[PDB]
């Protein structure tokens, strides 16, 4: 199987293993109930170096990235990052991502790990001019620190301002303990938050310093539960679920990340715009059990009789005390107090769509 950088130090940390589309990745440390409890209060360290990275470079790199994304890529500066989709000619998403500008015409291209060979012959299909597109996936690892406190943490490791970044920016070739490292203040949790870029072989290193760092702010290693947890309250896309060949950004619920008007063409531009400007015929929910059932990726969602859609996540809410699941469903159905029956092994079970993000 697919391994991190970090991998060798899971078993110190108590991390329960999951295959997580061919990387295993940790599922939790401890428990999903506490480690979302951390990353509410205090702190949380995410390993999440599955990620690909590729860079960008070349006179043309910017003409061909505002054809390839959502987002309008002009809006960057050195040190600012964006988040952006990636869409096919009918809107639906190749990937979402992060894009750095690290120079003048050089950009670092945060991917999802079950992406990369497809974002990469998506965009090699799609060069023109000056444009290099350079796989750096297994040179670089990614620590993630999220929560009320991981400012905090971070002062302690690094002699940079790292207090002075506003969100989507980042300090590059930042030191911590000797260590080169990118700096950015990103998350993927919803609470204040960073994340580290560093040479694969100096992960191991920053992530032990990290928990020392954190031991007295009560940081601890979080997983994969976690995340999806973080991710309801925040309502936050993960592709392969909320984002797919067959979701649109708008109706995933990102369209801030859609910049429509862009004078650039992009691919998706049009069928986006439409459902930018009237809305689309799908849109991205919160769903609470009112009847007990475990909803997943995938289940059926149906009222009077009829589809209306699909989960899309399955998860638990500690700050509701039920299960819930986030689910893709007609537009006509997404107003908050409606309720809806979910497809549990044959069986229709009741949920009642809730206001999501927190």
């Given at each position: 199987?697919?391994?991190?950088?970090?991998?060798?130090?899971?078993?110190?940390?108590?991390?329960?293993?999951?295959?997580?589309?061919?990387?295993?990745?940790?599922?939790?440390?401890?428990?999903?109930?506490?480690?979302?409890?951390?990353?509410?209060?205090?702190?949380?360290?995410?390993?999440?170096?599955?990620?690909?990275?590729?860079?960008?470079?070349?006179?043309?790199?910017?003409?061909?990235?505002?054809?390839?994304?959502?987002?309008?890529?002009?809006?960057?500066?050195?040190?600012?990052?964006?988040?952006?989709?990636?869409?096919?000619?009918?809107?639906?998403?190749?990937?979402?991502?992060?894009?750095?500008?690290?120079?003048?015409?050089?950009?670092?291209?945060?991917?999802?790990?079950?992406?990369?060979?497809?974002?990469?012959?998506?965009?090699?299909?799609?060069?023109?001019?000056?444009?290099?597109?350079?796989?750096?996936?297994?040179?670089?690892?990614?620590?993630?620190?999220?929560?009320?406190?991981?400012?905090?943490?971070?002062?302690?490791?690094?002699?940079?301002?790292?207090?002075?970044?506003?969100?989507?920016?980042?300090?590059?070739?930042?030191?911590?303990?000797?260590?080169?490292?990118?700096?950015?203040?990103?998350?993927?949790?919803?609470?204040?938050?960073?994340?580290?870029?560093?040479?694969?072989?100096?992960?191991?290193?920053?992530?032990?310093?990290?928990?020392?760092?954190?031991?007295?702010?009560?940081?601890?290693?979080?997983?994969?539960?976690?995340?999806?947890?973080?991710?309801?309250?925040?309502?936050?896309?993960?592709?392969?679920?909320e984002?797919?060949?067959?979701i649109?950004?708008?109706e995933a619920g990102?369209?801030?990340?859609?910049?429509?008007?862009?004078?650039?063409?992009?691919?998706?531009?049009?069928?986006?715009?439409?459902?930018?400007?009237?809305?689309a015929k799908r849109k991205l929910v919160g769903l609470?059990?009112?009847?007990?059932?475990?909803p997943?990726?995938?289940y059926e969602v149906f009222q009077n009789?009829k589809s209306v859609g699909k989960v899309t996540?399955?998860?638990?809410?500690?700050?509701?005390?039920?299960?819930?699941g986030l689910a893709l469903i007609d537009s006509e159905t997404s107003e908050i107090?409606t309720v809806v029956d979910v497809?549990?092994?044959?069986?229709?079970?009741?949920a009642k769509v809730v206001?999501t993000?927190?």
């Amino acid at each position: 199987l697919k391994r991190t950088p970090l991998f060798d130090l899971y078993k110190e940390y108590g991390g329960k293993t999951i295959d997580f589309g061919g990387w295993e990745l940790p599922v939790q440390f401890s428990s999903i109930k506490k480690e979302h409890e951390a990353v509410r209060t205090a702190a949380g360290l995410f390993d999440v170096s599955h990620m690909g990275e590729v860079e960008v470079s070349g006179n043309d790199s910017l003409s061909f990235l505002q054809r390839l994304m959502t987002n309008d890529v002009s809006a960057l500066t050195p040190g600012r990052a964006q988040y952006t989709a990636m869409c096919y000619p009918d809107g639906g998403t190749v990937d979402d991502l992060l894009i750095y500008q690290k120079g003048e015409n050089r950009y670092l291209l945060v991917i999802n790990a079950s992406n990369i060979d497809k974002d990469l012959a998506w965009m090699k299909e799609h060069a023109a001019g000056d444009v290099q597109i350079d796989n750096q996936s297994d040179q670089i690892a990614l620590l993630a620190v999220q929560g009320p406190k991981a400012e905090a943490i971070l002062k302690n490791l690094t002699d940079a301002d790292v207090s002075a970044l506003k969100p989507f920016a980042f300090i590059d070739e930042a030191d911590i303990s000797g260590r080169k490292a990118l700096i950015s203040r990103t998350g993927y949790t919803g609470e204040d938050g960073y994340e580290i870029y560093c040479r694969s072989d100096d992960a191991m290193h920053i992530w032990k310093k990290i928990i020392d760092a954190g031991d007295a702010y009560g940081l601890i290693p979080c997983g994969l539960g976690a995340r999806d947890t973080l991710r309801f309250e925040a309502n936050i896309p993960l592709y392969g679920q909320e984002l797919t060949r067959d979701i649109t950004p708008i109706e995933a619920g990102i369209g801030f990340a859609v910049k429509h008007k862009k004078e650039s063409d992009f691919f998706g531009k049009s069928v986006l715009s439409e459902q930018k400007e009237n809305g689309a015929k799908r849109k991205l929910v919160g769903l609470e059990m009112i009847e007990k059932g475990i909803p997943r990726h995938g289940y059926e969602v149906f009222q009077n009789g009829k589809s209306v859609g699909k989960v899309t996540t399955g998860t638990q809410s500690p700050t509701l005390g039920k299960n819930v699941g986030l689910a893709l469903i007609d537009s006509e159905t997404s107003e908050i107090g409606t309720v809806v029956d979910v497809e549990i092994r044959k069986k229709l079970v009741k949920a009642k769509v809730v206001k999501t993000p927190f």
